[PDB]
Design a protein around this ligand. Sequence first.
Ligand SMILES: [Zn+2]
Ligand SMILES: [Zn+2]
Ligand SMILES: [Zn+2]
Lengths: 231, 105, 62, 534, 109, 118, 81, 25
Amino acid sequence: SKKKLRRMNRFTVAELKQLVARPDVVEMHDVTAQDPKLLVHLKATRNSVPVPRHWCFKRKYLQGKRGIEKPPFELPDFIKRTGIQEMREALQEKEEQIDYQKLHDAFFKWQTKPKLTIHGDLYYEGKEFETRLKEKKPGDLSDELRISLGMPVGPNAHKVPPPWLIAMQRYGPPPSYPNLKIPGLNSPIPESCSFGYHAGGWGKPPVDETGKPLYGDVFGTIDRTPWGELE
Amino acid sequence: AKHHPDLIFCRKQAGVAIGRLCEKCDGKCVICDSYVRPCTLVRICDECNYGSYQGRCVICGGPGVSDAYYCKECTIQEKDRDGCPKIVNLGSSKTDLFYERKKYG
Amino acid sequence: IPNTAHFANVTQIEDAVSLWAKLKLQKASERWQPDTEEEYEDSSGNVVNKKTYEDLKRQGLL
Amino acid sequence: LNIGLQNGVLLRTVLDPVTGDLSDTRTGSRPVKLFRVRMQGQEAVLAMSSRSWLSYSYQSRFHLTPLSYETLEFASGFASEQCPEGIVAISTNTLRILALEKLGAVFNQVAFPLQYTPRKFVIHPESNNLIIIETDHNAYTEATKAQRKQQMAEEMVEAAGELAAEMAAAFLNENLPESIFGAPKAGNGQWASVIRVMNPIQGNTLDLVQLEQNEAAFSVAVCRFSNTGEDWYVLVGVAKDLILNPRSVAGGFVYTYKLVNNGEKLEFLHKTPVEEVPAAIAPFQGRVLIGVGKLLRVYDLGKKKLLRKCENKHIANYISGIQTIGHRVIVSDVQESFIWVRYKRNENQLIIFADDTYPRWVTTASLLDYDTVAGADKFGNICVVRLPPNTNDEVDGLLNGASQKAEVIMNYHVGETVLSLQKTTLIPGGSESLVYTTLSGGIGILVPFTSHEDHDFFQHVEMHLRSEHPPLCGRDHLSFRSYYFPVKNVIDGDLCEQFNSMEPNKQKNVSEELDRTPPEVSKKLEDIRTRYAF
Amino acid sequence: VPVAAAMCVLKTGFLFVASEFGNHYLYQIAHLGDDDEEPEFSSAMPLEDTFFFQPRPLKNLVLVDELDSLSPILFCQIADLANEDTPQLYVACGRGPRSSLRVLRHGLE
Amino acid sequence: TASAVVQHMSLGVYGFGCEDSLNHLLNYVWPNVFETSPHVIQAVMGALEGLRVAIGPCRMLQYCLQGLFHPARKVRDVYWKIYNSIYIGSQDALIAHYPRIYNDDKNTYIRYELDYIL
Amino acid sequence: MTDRYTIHSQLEHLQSKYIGTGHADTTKWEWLVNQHRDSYCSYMGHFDLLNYFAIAENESKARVRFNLMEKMLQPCGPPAD
Amino acid sequence: KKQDLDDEEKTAKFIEEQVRRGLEG
Ligand SMILES: [Zn+2]
Ligand SMILES: [Zn+2]
Ligand SMILES: [Zn+2]
């Protein structure tokens, strides 16, 4: 009867979102806690880390991941500079039918840190293939995107015209993104760029009949030293 | 130890009597069950040093031959403050091996 | 009503509209209305909303 | 042997058939003459170049401390019955029989008394006077005390008894100096505060203001509003009916004062009510930031009462202090951490753009440069927190905090609450250092290394000393320094400087572990202190 | 005497009074404090009220010495507010009526 | 076996400032915390207390919060086991780390002595 | 069944060995009160937090210590049932 | 030995600077 008494007084997910100051934080299962109020308040504190997603999944963790084939682990490039890949291949192949200064320099002289996630980055099944999104930034580009466009990749990409910069200057930039500035369209042509119609031109500056730009500015019209640094 | 979870420690107040290990078991930490970096000495409960047990291998139960130490880890996380680590259960392993012995030869 | 994570597990229309009232009021408070709250200096030595001050400013006189 | 040149520098050296080792400092561009006296149970040396430097191996350590007195032509030791131990000193057309005080206590001092617990004080930059706000919970302001005293005397007379025997005026004359007989003071919610303009050279209080009874003063700033001229103004936050342990107020006010008479007289302008206790104030681009309660306002000075030019209400808990570099603003709240904040001016907004990932009850903060802030903590730590390199200064959630967080690059458990951190240089031309003082009375400094060689060296000194000379009480030094958050990027100077007092055989153990000799190692210790500090 | 965190009464009639904040003190005992007109309270005398008494400046002790102390240090600011080029410390410290503003320098008095 | 490695590594790097990478390794280690085979569950718990001494308890506490009061009971078991293993060590350091918890009508849950402002 | 009651015995004994640990049915009240009581013992410990409160209020460290130890009895109001 | 020489030079730098400052003094 006591279990039923708590059930009878148990809150709906709508009520729990209502009284609670933050409602998103509130999951469908939080309504099943002993104290809905303390649990939502504890999930609504800064810097906390949410419980891993697979607690309820009937199947196992990485057992569910299973079936596809995976390429063997790829060595850190600075270990790869030693070539111990080649030495191991040669000895292994002879059987199948290295100097020391390079190794010490590889560990100390030229070893550098990797890219590491900050506190709150939980691992989950698919995070290695999760598509990085949200990047609403027009300025960021790729090399696969540039090449598969036929647009230059690397340091010349800025003078390599994105084929929709001419449509930015023609209909305005993408209308969902007024905040989009396009170099050579709403900011000046990048350094050493040239507006033009030849292969590699920046079009013509978006212009009104008095001589002001209709989009951005097509021509481009403290003491940050750290405190205690080594020498 | 970390290897047979069926084992128990005395867990009373430590004392001043040092702990000793058999020649058989010697060379290891009692808890982290490694074999390295001995830092600090073991101390044992008054009962667990009373009686014939003056100088016995804490683990193997046998003759005291050397001192018993604590690994650097266990002393860094302060697992060395739980009193007598004297194991007050003999454990199935010694019994069963002796029994199969008496059977065979 | 914008479909946002705040409405996760809301299935009833009445709950969605209500939740909306509280959420609208809260974002109302956290957002700062500059003109509605700014305090401007009456030249005699008084304080009135910047919106009223600019309105009256032009408003033949201010 | 001790060597004095005539360009003010001086050398020490130990004596052998040859001069073996050396170390040298400066002592003034005028020729350096050396003299002998015996002091406090030890012989020690004088030396004058442009002031007098007493050098003594302070229980086996050279301390070379200047004195507080005028320049000299000659002197020598002296003893008497009148002056049992001291100095004959002939000086600028003068002869002096002197005596030297406590031969410890690196610092001098001179004391000027106050009335209340002085919570804060700022320096008026033209005249160089101090504005101090003093406060006391559980006390009586002078008015109410005199009134209540005489009033109690009034209910004395009503005893209706021989009326004749009148202790009334006797009492009312009697005032025991509170400084020595205790503070005749009590009440639970009753504050009392005071403002004082005080000259720093001589102790005289140039001016004084006594707030009402239940008013407490919590923060003060000295600014110059852009719209008005060059007049300096003093703003004094004030809470009204604070109750401490439950917590509730009537509310705040912000007294404003004109700072007239070249910097020697406060005179009232106006007090603007405000809806919580404004706990910290700062000048900022011609207008004054004021953190009140949990909100952060930009205010500007009107001639009726302060006006509100902008605001932010996201700040988490309650605002304890606020710092501002030229462009952006480090709010520092009581529980959550430092919170960075950017002031978009033309568009007139304050935008939260990045903040710390830890909880940390900040008491005081200080800005090392654009990127980094060094903050004390109330439990005893010191942290140093810098924004990572690539951040976007200007935006318009993540882990319930702001979008991008700030990494922590030094943690260290000083040992006592640190109430005031500040970056400066002590000796002239000696390199910038970070001076902290604490709530027990200690004054320490933190000092950045410059060269990986030395940093690794000191690291190995302390690592070996740690295990070969453990603390007395059995604490484990690494743990102690890592009480709350684990130590990171700091070398302990008071472990290392204990080498000199270990026992020589162990001195040798270590000294060989680095393959140096005790003198070599000791000198290399004495550098950092010699060159950064006293 | 200002509130103490520990008194310790030596031999030789000293009495070291370590005020919890501010300066310390070392007194000596020049009267063992009996046989005068100060009324002595007791366990035995009845009332139903509490006996009163009246404070007075020192009689039975004398202040031999006084150790300087800084604690607490409520604010500190390192600055150059006199001519000289070594910056002084302005350390505003104390509690209650015994509070003070101290100026410190490197040197010996 | 990977969890054993992290244990020993963090115990060796104690106090040298290599915390960012230990923090990242802790992020991968954490999700195994729901597991059954005694050898792996016990290797994981060992790793977690090593990481406690090397990261601090403020971190482990932030990781351990949201599930102290979860509606499940398998998780609440696991989380209270971890949170004890912390609290036994470093139960003093945990003082300046607990979150601030709002008081309800008939109790008082906030410690005000900690924000006596000076 | 077996799991619940052996872990229940282990948690009750570990708790009666260490005041303040928890178990899967610890309630908000016991959590919060153990957490206060530890804060109190630690203020009286660290010689310094004592100075901080004894200056924030205007009491003397003996009176402060006394009030802390008075409160350690029932710090978060009376129990909940 | 190079490190010894180096710190010798460091000290020479210090003394030179402080004494030249005294020289302006
Ligand atoms: Zn071990
Ligand atoms: Zn025992
Ligand atoms: Zn054995």
